Design a protein around this ligand. Structure first.
Ligand SMILES: CCCCC[C@H](O)C/C=C1/C(=O)C=C[C@@H]1C/C=C\CCCC(=O)O
Ligand SMILES: CCCCC[C@H](O)C/C=C1/C(=O)C=C[C@@H]1C/C=C\CCCC(=O)O
Ligand SMILES: CCCCCCCCCCCCCC(=O)O
Ligand SMILES: CCCCCCCCCCCCCC(=O)O
Ligand SMILES: CCCCCCCCCCCCCC(=O)O
Ligand SMILES: CCCCCCCCCCCCCC(=O)O
Ligand SMILES: CCCCCCCCCCCCCC(=O)O
Ligand SMILES: CCCCCCCCCCCCCC(=O)O
Length: 576
């Protein structure tokens, strides 16, 4: 409702942030334009912005942000030659022009791998012209991730900027930097697979599924809030998520900032943990809030049995308004259990619902639903037990060999997944082990759910459109809370015909000695999957015996071709 919207945004964000976000937003629409062209356009938009700051009444200062972006986009002179139909958007009036740009954000980019320079070269470059070096990489990530919400991409950039400061100075520029950059990469990976999971989930499962999830997550977060307040938050969050998924950066950022403002003007009835977030500038407020730790729950909440099992009014209260009642149940359950994953809370509410449907229909409903809590039993135990055993295995073996145990396990279940994907999914599950198994027990399930749900959804995006397995499509298109259970119930594939021996696959040279850590790991792991694909029936003593001998073939050789010939020979018979 301001006179100059571009001026208002520039005085609030601050110039450095405004330039960064302008660069991100243009790079996400104009993906094939070279860095220096985006620089020129940024400088132009920034300079016009300043005229509005100095005089809100200056020409064109009163146009909306949408109009000004669209107008700028339509002055790029090679728009049609490079973008084709996207130039057709320019002929259209603004409500419509802006919708048209939205439908044309490419997403298969098609760009070439971004190779990390050598550390020596990045530090050098960071030092000689810090902004070009950072800004160019923001541009590179943004054009390769055109749906990544722009302020979050800016928040990560500030993290890289921090890291180069830190490390481009000390005794070793590899023992400071590399593990920071590697942690930033996995974490950026997650953040992005996560935004796509939220949006695709809303389509597949519906607003109702989505809302159940939010009731649960926010009840865990704000266990002191009243249900009515939790429900108002999920209704507004639902609408935000919905606008953000439609994709218009300004509209998403407006709704998110409105929700932030509400949250902060109501801290006392939501959470004693919001003080710091609610002091942050607008740009980081909502982001801080979505990341806040769970508040402490209030002391000695009653058990759930009274309102949900014991009351004579159960069926009556349910049937008046079934979703509100199930949402009260889910709220009451989740506030008590910061330690459950959200999907387990859903599985629990969905169980309570299936039980009230059957039983409320009976002459004596109470006798029928009297044991429902006992049904929550094994639902809770199952994920806790799988987590417990996998962290113990992880403790017993360490990451790389845990990764290896995960390879033979998953290759036997779904041998017809390609070798790189199996390698990839297993190295990554190993990372979820090493990050989640450091939580005590009462944090492990929420952790595990976070990362696995990310890892599985991408699994499921790959598979779709490159289908190799009916059992993977089954798990990938299951309901939301059934997905991870479905993968977990996968057994060793008894259908699978062994891959025929391939001579080249188990022949290695001197290189493996000299390549890096990682790459030697991938190479050995590729071979191992290949090993399992050829003898799907190998027992574990037999695999180990063969793995110990590969490491002894590698150990003493660094004889690659004649021994390897008898590495193979000996192996094809300890497995024959
Ligand atoms: C062997 C690949 C190494 C990593 C890939 C490059 O470093 C790009 C850098 C990214 C980043 O930082 C965040 C997201 C992208 C990568 C994600 C998906 C690419 C798949 C579809 C596509 O990009 O065509
Ligand atoms: C992404 C922050 C915005 C600006 C951050 C710094 O400019 C980056 C500087 C880099 C560097 O010097 C070497 C590698 C990174 C780029 C890496 C991956 C791209 C996508 C990975 C992801 O999804 O974060
Ligand atoms: C398509 C043109 C993009 C407009 C430039 C970005 C404006 C900055 C929005 C940042 C506000 C974030 C609000 C929030 O996420 O809580
Ligand atoms: C997602 C659930 C995050 C817990 C707290 C929600 C804060 C709302 C911030 C708006 C983000 C859309
Ligand atoms: C797999 C997704 C469905 C999970 C739903 C299980 C039963 C809980 C229903 C909650 C309905 C949303 C009502 C609300 O809490 O606002
Ligand atoms: C911390 C476990 C290391 C990673 C290995 C895979 C184990 C999967 C445990 C599943 C818990 C999922 C949450 C849920 O579905 O309720
Ligand atoms: C493409 C499917 C190959 C298997 C790779 C990951 C399988 C899903 C794992 C989910 C976490 C482990 C599930 C489990 O073993 O209980
Ligand atoms: C029939 C071919 C026999 C050689 C193929 C064996 C592949 C062994 C990979 C095992 C590496 C995991 C343990 C390690 O890196 O030391």
């Amino acid at each position: 409702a301001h006179k100059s919207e571009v001026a208002h945004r520039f005085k609030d964000l601050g110039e450095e942030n405004f330039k960064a976000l302008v660069l991100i937003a243009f790079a996400q629409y104009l993906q094939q334009c070279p860095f220096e062209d985006h620089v020129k356009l940024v400088n132009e938009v920034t300079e016009f912005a300043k005229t509005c700051v100095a005089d809100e009444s200056a020409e064109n200062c009163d146009k909306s942000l949408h109009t000004l972006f669209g107008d700028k986009l339509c002055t790029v002179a090679t728009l049609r030659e490079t973008y084709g139909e996207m130039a057709d958007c320019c002929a259209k009036q603004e409500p419509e022009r802006n919708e048209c740009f939205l439908q044309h954000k490419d997403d298969n980019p098609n760009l070439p791998r971004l190779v990390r320079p050598e550390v020596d070269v990045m530090c050098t470059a960071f030092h000689d012209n810090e902004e070009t070096f950072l800004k160019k990489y923001l541009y590179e990530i943004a054009r390769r991730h055109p749906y990544f919400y722009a302020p979050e991409l800016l928040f990560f950039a500030k993290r890289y900027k921090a890291a180069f400061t830190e490390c481009c100075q000390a005794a070793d520029k590899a023992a400071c930097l590399l593990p920071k950059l590697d942690e930033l990469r996995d974490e950026g990976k997650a953040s992005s697979a996560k935004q796509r999971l939220k949006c695709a989930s809303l389509q597949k499962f519906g607003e109702r599924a989505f809302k159940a999830w939010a009731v649960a997550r926010l009840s865990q977060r704000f266990p002191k809030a009243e249900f009515a307040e939790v429900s108002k938050l999920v209704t507004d969050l639902t609408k935000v998520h919905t606008e953000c998924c439609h994709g218009d950066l300004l509209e998403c950022a407006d709704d998110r900032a409105d929700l932030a403002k509400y949250i902060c003007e109501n801290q006392d009835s939501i959470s004693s943990k919001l003080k710091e977030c609610c002091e942050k500038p607008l740009l980081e407020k909502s982001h801080c809030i979505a990341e806040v730790e769970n508040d402490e729950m209030p002391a000695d909440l009653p058990s759930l049995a009274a309102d949900f099992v014991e009351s004579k009014d159960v069926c009556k209260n349910y049937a008046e308004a079934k979703d509100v009642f199930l949402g009260m149940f889910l709220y009451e359950y989740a506030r008590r259990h910061p330690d459950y994953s959200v999907v387990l809370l859903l599985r629990l509410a969905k169980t309570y619902e299936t039980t009230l449907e059957k039983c409320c229909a009976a002459a004596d409903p109470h006798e029928c639903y009297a044991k429902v809590f006992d049904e929550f039993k094994p639902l809770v135990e199952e994920p806790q037990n799988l987590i417990k055993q996998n962290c113990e295995l992880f403790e017993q073996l360490g990451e790389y060999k845990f990764q290896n145990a995960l390879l033979v396990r998953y290759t036997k279940k779904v041998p017809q997944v390609s070798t790189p994907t199996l390698v990839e999914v297993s190295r990554n599950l190993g990372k979820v082990g090493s990050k989640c198994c450091k939580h005590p027990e009462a944090k492990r399930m929420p952790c595990a759910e976070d990362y696995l749900s990310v890892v599985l959804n991408q699994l499921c995006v790959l598979h779709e459109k490159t289908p190799v397995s009916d059992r993977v499509t089954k798990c990938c298109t299951e309901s939301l809370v059934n997905r991870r259970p479905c993968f977990s119930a996968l057994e060793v594939d008894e259908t699978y015909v062994p891959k025929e021996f391939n001579a080249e696959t188990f022949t290695f040279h001197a290189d493996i000695c000299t390549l890096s850590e990682k790459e030697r790991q991938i190479k050995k792991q590729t071979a191992l999957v290949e090993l399992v694909k050829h003898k799907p029936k190998a027992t574990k003593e037999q695999l180990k015996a063969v793995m110990d001998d590969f490491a002894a073939f590698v150990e003493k050789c660094c004889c690659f071709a004649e021994e390897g010939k008898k590495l193979v020979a000996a192996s094809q018979a300890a497995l024959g």
